[model samples]
Structure formats: structure tokens, C-alpha cells
Target: ELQLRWQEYRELVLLLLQWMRHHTAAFEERFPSSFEEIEILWSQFLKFKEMELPAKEADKNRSKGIYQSLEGAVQAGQLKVPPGYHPLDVEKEWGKLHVAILEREKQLRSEFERLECLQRIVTKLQMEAGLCEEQLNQADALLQSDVRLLAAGKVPQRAGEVERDLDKADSMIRLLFNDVQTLKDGRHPQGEQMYRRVYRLHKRLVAIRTEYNLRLK
Candidate 1:
């Protein structure tokens, strides 16, 4: 009876070890491309750990009881000690597996943080770009009406306002360029697309500035 129970415990321990190894291997093999995917993977990992906790505690208690029983059986000289079934060996294996899991968790945390940082920078850039575009469009409309005022031989009161708006848009476009550079430096996956969009906006701003300067003359 003791021998049968020990065999069952051994199989259980080995199966758990295999299961953990498989999960860690799969995690490493599949790298997430986006922040959303990383979030999903991270949450799934946490859920798995939560679900495994009770099972792990039960296994620990079972191991302790089995070890005590096996020890007593061997001491009574009624049972021969199994050749390769030492409980200490299983404990050591579990210790190594625990270390491996900790390392994997550390890696996942750092990756999650990195992706989160990139996500923030991308959102900020997008919002700033929208505001800059609005300013550019407003300046274009004001410039158009200022031309009509010039044709009527009346100096436009809004000339100063238009110039200020253009200045503000110019500064904002420059800053947008800088942020795009940051995205590139960070090696964001959308770096190329963002750069193209920012570049087009900058060109439009430059065209408006050129037309404004001609009107000043």
C-alpha cells in the first residue's frame, strides 16, 4: 500500500514539473507584438498562478504525509526503500522549477512596462498632432480672409492674430517632430507610419508659412 501511494505521488510531481516546463517554454516561444497582446498574456499568467495555488498547497501536504509514511515503513524493515524515489530529490526539483518561474515572471513584468511606456508616448503624440492640425487649418482660413482685406486697401486687424496662430503652429509642429524622433529612437513598431504622418503635416505647415511670408511682402 505504501509503495503504491509513493508511485502515485511520484507521478503527480513529475506531471506538474512537465506542465510548468511546457508553459514556460510556450511563453518564451510566442512573443506578443502589441501592448494589448502583452496585457492579455500577463493577465492569463496571473490567472494561471491563482488557479494553481490551492492545488500546489494540497500537493505539498500530500508530499509531507507520504514522506512521513515512507520513512516509517522503511524503519520497520517491512518495506524496501524504492531505488529512485527520494522525497528530497523531488523537493530539490521543485525548488529549481520555482526559480525558473520567478525568472520568467520578472521578464514578463519588464516587457509589460516597456510596452506601456511606448503606448503612452504614442497616445500623446497623436493628441498633439490633432491639435496642431486644427491650428494650421485656422491659420489658413484667417490668411485667406486677410488677402481679401489687403485687396480692399484696408489693413486687417486680425493680421497679428493670424501671425501668432502660425507661430504657435510652427512651434507645435517642431515639437511633434521631436516626439516622432523619440518614437523612432524607442523603436516603436508604428514608428515609420507616424513619421510619415508628421512629415506630411510639417510640409503643409511650411507651405502655409511660405504663402504668409509672400502676403507680408
Candidate 2:
């Protein structure tokens, strides 16, 4: 029974060791300090098994001390859960480790807040862009009749209308660019790539508005 217990402990440690190594990057990034903490626990556990098994009382307390620090690390969100680790990865013997209780509440809360902010920006842009699209389309239709009529000072255009359109075009581009910048700020690198294509469409729309403004003026 004693040998069997030792074997179970050894196998549990081995599985956890492999799991940690497999998700090394996540551990390093999310729980930089805990990697060493885990390493220390493993080393001490191995040392106790090899030389101090007969001194079970003292050795058990020492082992429990390491796990206490690990519990602190976990509760403080300083310990990362590897990909293969699950709620039931460990059996009853490892209950004190509290592995199943690990939660990414901090990260999840942060991500939730960021998404809410982004949704607000996108929703505002969607409504405003639709209005701008129609105005540009109307300007295009008017210009289609005769560009020279406006150039020749034949078509009576509202004073400052061209200036208004120019300002409107500038404002739209600025808003769209700002929206894309928000995603980049949120660490979405591909946001810029997506922005590049959206920007091309924005440029064409601005050009139409600008052309209409010029023809009318």
C-alpha cells in the first residue's frame, strides 16, 4: 500500500510536469514567477521521496508548505492553467492542491470590458457611415449630368457647400481611422490589415465627395 501510494504521487507529479512544459509560453507570460515556484515544489517533492520517506511527518509538512505557497499563487491569479489541465486532472490525493479551482476571472473580466468598448465604437460608426454613404451617392449622381456646367459657373451651388462637403469627408476618414486605431490599441495586430482595406473604400468615398464639391464650386 505504501509503495502504491508513492507510485501514484510520482505519476501525478510527472503528468503535471509534462503539462507545464507543454504550455511553457502561457506560463511564462501569465505566471512568470509561478514557474519557478512549481519547479521548486517538484524538486523538493523528488528530494523528499528519495531520501526522507521514512521521516514522513516532517517531510509531509515541508511538502505542504510548498503547496501552500502554490495555493497563494493560484488564488492571486499568478498561476496559469496549462492547456491539457482540466477540472478533474488530479484524483483525490491531490485535492489539497486545488487545481480545479483555478479561474481566469481577471483575464475574462478585462476582455469583457474591452469588447464592450469596441462594440460602442463600431455601432456609432455603422449608423454615421450609412448617412455619409448616401450623401456621397447623391453628390455623384448630380455630378454625372455635366461636370463642366458647375465648372463653367452655370449651376448655382450653395455658398460654402463645397467647404462643408470637404470638411464632412475629412471627418468621416478621421472617425474610421480612429476606430481602427482602437482595435490596434487593444493589441489586435490584424486590425491594421483589416483597416487598410476599409481605408481604400473610405478613400474612394472621400474622392467622390471631394469631386462633387469641386464640380459644384
Candidate 3:
């Protein structure tokens, strides 16, 4: 009986080992920083899985023969536990342990799936954050060039120049404003406050230019 039980356990552990090997990549991708930890845990799991405990081959064969003989004898008469060995008496206890193992496995799988979803969300948020920062950088570049041109009195001298610079600067401002608003609309975490500040600054600049009748030409 013990030999049969150990063989059953050994087969179950082999199944688990196969599953672990195949599913490892999915975990590694989602939890890059935890790969080493995952490896260590699997190492221990496989180590324990390979262990066949407490019986040599001759002993297992003899025990099986004895158990078979006892069963036949019990049908004919009766039985007692053998000398020098304490067999576990837990055909009933297995019901509770089976329930507990199944319930905990369910919970662990659910939590694992939830973490997988979270990793997807994290990746998306990072992408949006990068785009938002890129737009902000473009706005800064435009502002720097415009400010320097205004301060240096380097405005071009032609009707063509006047209309061209005027149109170009206004278009650039609108593009910057639009990008900021897009960032806000895209669910960027810090986008609302960033857009608020940029919009206010944009409006102030437009107002200042109108007040002084400033033109790039």
C-alpha cells in the first residue's frame, strides 16, 4: 500500500514539474526582477519532487506481497498491524487534506492571473508616460527658440516674413497646446496638472504678444 501511494505521489510530482517548466516563461516575462526567485523556488520544488522516501525496492516488494496476503486472509478470518512498523491510518484524513489543497490552489491561480493583468496595465501606463514626456519636450524646445528670437530682435523684415513667422509660431503654439490636452485626455497619471500649467502659460504668452503688438518679422 505504501509503495503504491508513493508511486502515485511520484507521478503527481512529475506532472507538476512538467507544468513548471512550460509555464516558467510566462512568469519570467511578467516578473523580470523576480526571475531568480522563481528559479530558486522551482529548484526546491523539483528537488523535493524527485525524492522517493522511506523504502528500498526489496522492502516495497515484500510489503506489497504481505499486504495482498493479509487482505486475502482477512476475508477468510481477521488481521492486526504488523510488528516493527507503524502504518499511517488516514484514509479518512485524506478527504480534508484534498479539500484544502484544491481550495488553496484555486486561490493561488486567481491571484496569479490578477498579477498578470496588472503587468499589462503597468506596461501601458509606462508607454503613455513616455509619450507625454516627449510632447512636453517638444513644447520646451519651441518655447526656447521663440523666447530667444523675441529677446534678440531677430525678426525678419518682409511681408512674407511677417506672415510666415506669425503663422508658424501660432501653429506651433496650438500644436503644443493640443499635445498637452491629448496627454490629459489619455489618462496619464500626472497629465491633468501638467496640462493646467502649460495651458495657463500658453494663454499668458498669447496675451503678452497681443498687448505689445509683437511680431517675429
Candidate 4:
């Protein structure tokens, strides 16, 4: 009966091990749509950890004295030993499972923090991009309305300032292009869309620069 119980416990641990392996493999490829989704998955993982406590307790008790008796029975030839159901084998497997679970929890935490950081960066970039767009539009309006001011004394000085501002904005956007690539490399869910927005902004900036150059000539 003890052997049977041990077998049952061993089977339970194996099932859990299989589940953990499958989940870990799948998790690597899965990207959450939102922070809330990550939070929900984290909560579920916590629940699973809670459920593992009972099995851990059972294993602890078995280690204390239960396994020693089973060992004695096997040594005395009073108990029939199964091929891989030895107490030591099962105990080792359980220990490995415990370590894997802890490692997985740590990984989940790091990945969550990474995603949170990436999201904050994306938000900052979006706000910066919005300001650049506003400035570009304002410059466009000034250039369109003051056609007579082109190459004029005061207008050229103002246009120089505008050109410098455009150059600064263009350089900033170029740096942000690298950031967009990092986001995509990180496998962000909105990576493609973010890339599109930045690309469009750069294209518009180029177009405005060309127009300004032509008007200056």
C-alpha cells in the first residue's frame, strides 16, 4: 500500500512536470495584448503555486521517515521493487521539479518587468513624436502664409531657426528609429504599428525639408 501511494505521488509529480515544460515552451512564444493580460496570467501562476503546496508537504513528510521504511523493505527483499518507482528516483525528480518551478517564477517576473519598461518607453516616444508633428505643422503654416518673406532679411533668419529645429527633430527621429527596432526585436505586440507611425513621420519631415529647400532656392 505504501508503494502504491508512492507511485501515485510520483505520477502526480510527473504530470506536473510535463505541464510545466509545456507551459514554459508556450509562454516563450506568447505575447500579451495588454498589461492586464499579463497581470491575469501572473495571478493564475500564483494560484498554481498555491496548489503545489500540498504536494510539497506530502514530499516533505515522505522524506522525513516514510522513504526510510520503504528503503528498508526493499533491502530486506520483503517488498517488490518497480523498475523506476524507487523512492530515491521519485525524490530526485520532485526536487528537480521544485527548482524548475522557482526558476519559472523568476523568469515570469523578469519578463513582466521588461514588458512594463518597454511600454513606458513606447509611451514616451509617442508623446515626443506628437510634439515633433505639432512643431512641423506650425512651421509648415508659417512657410505657406509668408511666401513673400522668403529670402527676406528677417524671414531668412527665422527660416534658419526653423531649419535648425527641423534638423534637430530629424536627428531625434533617427535615434528613435533604432528604438523602434529594439521594440520589434523584443517582440512587442504593437511593434509593426509603432514602426509605421515613425516611418510616416520621417517621410513627412523629409517632404517638408524638400519643400523648404525649393522655396529657399
lDDT tens digits, residue span 1-217, model 2: 4344334444445555444344333323432122344355445544644554345434334444444445545567766444333233432323323232133334434555665676676676666666656655655555554565656667644435544654675677677777778866765435667477457657767677666556554
**Which scores greater on lDDT, model 1 or model 3?**
1
* Tens-digit lDDT string for candidate 1 (183-210): 7776677888998988988898889889
Candidate 3 wrongly placed segments (more than 4 Å): 1-92, 153-217
TM-score of each: 0.64, 0.48, 0.35, 0.77
TM-score ranking, high to low: 4, 1, 2, 3
List the lowest-lDDT window of 10 residues for candidate 1.
81-90
- Best-matching candidate per TM-score: 4
Each model's number of backbone clashes?
0, 0, 0, 0
- lDDT of predicted model 2: 0.51
lDDT of 3: 0.44
Q: Per-residue lDDT for 213 in model 3?
A: 48
Reference-based lDDT, each prediction: 0.76, 0.51, 0.44, 0.69
lDDT of 4 by residue, 1-217 (tens): 8777556545654554455456555444444556777788778778767875566556545543554656666688876655645555555655665676687678678878888878877988788788878877876775665565654544543577568767877877886787788788877788898888889889888888888888754
What is the clash tally of candidate 2?
0
Ranking by lDDT: 1, 4, 2, 3
Number of backbone clashes in candidate 3: 0
